[PDB]
């Protein structure tokens with residue numbers, strides 16, 4: 001299919017960055033359609049690590065035009081920081097990166113707010129990445145936030161910014177009893193970059209409609225994961241954007257009927273950073289194992305990540321929410337050396353009922369317990385293996401079992417962090 | 432196609448209610464996926480008017496199950512009010528209506544807030560319908576708002592509600608210097624209806640995935656219109672939800688790949704209630720005419736509606752944003768008796784540039800001017816006509832011209848408010 005969507009089917013960090021980088025070889029465009037720099041994508045090419053947050057993961061391929069879709073909450077400071085870093089490394093970002101004038105801006109007060117709220121919640125704290133994602137989205141929805149296109153008139157921008165800031169400042173000092181955020185500091189930091197920012201603007205919907213009508217290969221890059229969806233995730237322990245395939249058309253402006261294949265990234269084992277339900281969470285040795293081997297620590301905040309077994313029930317919600325076309329089994333190489341692996345196939349609800357469907361809001365997950373299927377592990381190494389043949393049968397069964405349990409084929413299997421450490425069984429672009 | 436989406440291509444009020452009611456004859460389900468009771472849908476069957484706001488327009492057909500999707504901001508008071516009204520009229524709502532536990536709740540403070548903000552904006556006031564749509568969506572995104580499923584535990588609900596209310600109350604009295612909203616009044620009004628509310632809950636995504644897998648005819652009913660889209664509309668003069676086809680999958684939980692046909696409702700002339708850009712707005716006799724004949728006054732607030740000529744440029748943005756499959760030319764009967772009609776085919780930008788693309792945010796529409804195409808009108812009456820033959824050639828040309836100018840066929844033509852006063856040239860369900 002021409003328009004391919006790559007997204008996380010769990011709670012982020014499944015490995016979208018690598019896969020997006022990999023798959024963009026044949027792509028004309030790559031589009032981020034939601035989130036901001038809370039995202040953390042690690043690309044590894046012949047050993048060279050590149051960590052992207054706000055910039056689309058297709059930025060390393062000169063044949064691809066990376067787009068920041070209107071859905072993205074964009075931090076000028078964050079963009080500048082990343083651009084500079086890639087530029088020093090030979091990546092002419094400004095030559096490859098375009099962006100929507102409709103993108104809301106993440107300015108300092110947003111982080112001020114993000115921190116304050118987080119504080120206020122005390123114990124039942126969400127565990128947000130500390131960027132100002134939440135407030136930026138709130139300001140969008142409230143229709144008071146600033147967007148890229150607001151920089152088209154700096155004086156008017158100073159007017160709007162003065163307003164929005166006094167408004168937020170009042171809340172910060174009087175209610176939160178927190179320090180105000182200096183309006184002039186913000187206006188200044190902003191105006192300095194404004195010109196660079198404005199230079200990358202393009203009418204994204206139209207560009208995408210044109211690309212679409214030409215047949216251009218376009219990849220949409222997801223941020224965060226399905227279960228962190230503001231609507232469909234473990235609310236309120238979620239991110240503030242729709243991480244489900246529906247955000248592509250809303251955050252890019254491309255009509256929904258033009259999505260061709262939805263590729264869902266699947267970690268082979270589960271992780272979460274932030275508070276919230278997690279039935280298959282492990283707190284034992286194997287958990288520790290899964291964490292160490294997988295080097296599970298957030299690419300955007302370091303914070304160790306919670307680990308647990310893959311959960312076909314949660315994965316199955318992801319399948320329906322996103323119209324999955326196929327999966328990209330990632331980190332299989334991490335299971336190597338376990339005596340046995342297991343998949344959560346059903347949930348035992350607190351009233352005794354057994355169910356193969358997930359609850360929605362966090363409180364409804366309160367006391368659910370996982371009912372497992374236990375498969376034999378494999379001692380052979382699968383790291384770097386690039387052909388099914390190189391995988392032991394135990395691994396092949398685990399893979400088939402996931403397919404059986406989900407009804408979606410594993411078209412791509414990843415066995416290490418490096419771009420080429422992958423098995424492309426079915427390339428979504430031909431699919 | 433099995434899953435058909437019906438939405439407004441302009442600024443609301445194109446006539447979704449009638450069309451949805453009409454088209455649901457063959458439907459198993461009808462789903463609202465966004466907005467709340469700011470919407471106003473007028474159904475007319477053999478002269479009997481029915482005005483829906485929050486309840487899906489398929490509620491009058493016992494063969495159809497009406498669903499309030501998670502995307503909808505739901506006012507318990509509003510729901511109760513409408514249910515009662517339909518029940519007295521022989522409509523057993525509770526028997527036909529189901530709803531998502533994920534729907535955020537619109538409670539009193541939300542209206543308190545909606546009013547306060549509106550006040551604060553003074554002159555540059557959005558012109559929101561006065562329901563608490565904006566705040567309810569903000570509370571959603573901020574992850575502090577209450578949802579239907581929160582009623583599954585009334586004590587915890589009282590806890591969460593006490594919190595959210597003190598929070599908002601502080602803002603209302605100290606900043607806005609407005610009157611606080613009584614927590615106990617809210618908790619009470621809510622708890623009284625809670626049980627009814629909870630009784631209608633269903634897991635909508637799953638139900639839709641099942642329906643989808645059965646082949647069931649499902650209609651998604653849009654609220655508001657494309658150009659009022661929070662992301663793609665004339666921001667900030669927009670509604671707080673994505674009125675574009677992308678909201679269907681986000682606000683219903685049905686995977687995006689399962690949308691089959693997107694039907695866009697097209698008024699044949701333009702209207703707007705609320706502040707904001709409107710290039711083809713008319714302030715002359717014909718405007719007055721268009722308003723009087725069309726009886727253009729908001730079904731949700733009465734407020735006279737601004738009128739202007741149809742705008743192919745704005746309509747064309749709608750075509751790409753929503754992947755339109757076809758149009759439903761509505762109110763054609765209203766043009767009868769004009770000497771000449773005209774369509775805006777291009778925009779003359781303020782720097783002299785001529786463009787066939789629309790700007791996004793309001794300020795960017797600032798001084799655009801419409802460049803028209805002037806077609807001969809028609810004196811014959813088209814009211815109630817149900818066969819193309821009954822339409823004068825002048826009308827047929829106007830219709831073909833819209834098709835030529837947009838590239839989307841007019842599969843349905845409506846010539847009066849009554850259900851049967853329509854021409855179904857291509858029924859989306861077979862399409």
Ligand SMILES: Nc1nc2c(ncn2[C@@H]2O[C@H](COP(=O)(O)OP(=O)(O)O)[C@@H](O)[C@H]2O)c(=O)[nH]1
Pocket residue numbers: 008012013014015016017018039040041042043044294298299330331332333334414415416417418
């Ligand atoms: N061992 C192993 N590491 C992988 C594999 N695929 C990706 N990685 C690494 O695992 C991490 C994926 O987390 P992250 O980059 O935050 O993924 P993203 O947030 O979804 O883009 C990064 O450290 C990658 O370098 C794989 O198949 N095996």
Ligand SMILES: Nc1nc2c(ncn2[C@@H]2O[C@H](COP(=O)(O)OP(=O)(O)O)[C@@H](O)[C@H]2O)c(=O)[nH]1
Pocket residue numbers: 439443444445446447448449470471472473474475725729730761762763764765845846847848849
């Ligand atoms: N004259 C005329 N009225 C129509 C036609 N279709 C619908 N109506 C009426 O025009 C209005 C449509 O506005 P509204 O009900 O608010 O549409 P909605 O908000 O899109 O559901 C209602 O008064 C309908 O009764 C039509 O083809 N001709």
Ligand SMILES: O=P(O)(O)OC[C@H]1O[C@@H](n2cnc3c(OP(=O)(O)O)ncnc32)[C@H](O)[C@@H]1O
Pocket residue numbers: 008011012013014038039040041126127128129130131133134222223224225228237238239240273274275
């Ligand atoms: O308001 P926010 O800043 O968005 O934080 C809210 C919640 O969402 C989580 N979170 C945010 N981005 C995440 C991410 O990005 P990628 O998978 O794309 O690499 N991966 C994993 N978890 C992520 C935070 O942990 C928290 O639970």
Ligand SMILES: O=P(O)(O)OC[C@H]1O[C@@H](n2cnc3c(OP(=O)(O)O)ncnc32)[C@H](O)[C@@H]1O
Pocket residue numbers: 439442443444445469470471472557558559560561562564565653654655656659668669670671704705706
């Ligand atoms: O915050 P809000 O309460 O949503 O108001 C914001 C803006 O959106 C407009 N508006 C809201 N619902 C509308 C509607 O519903 P239907 O077309 O579905 O019948 N039709 C037309 N205009 C509508 C208001 O006029 C205002 O411009």
Ligand SMILES: [Mg+2]
Pocket residue numbers: 012013039040041042299300
């Ligand atoms: Mg990451």
Ligand SMILES: [Mg+2]
Pocket residue numbers: 443444470471472473730731
């Ligand atoms: Mg209406």
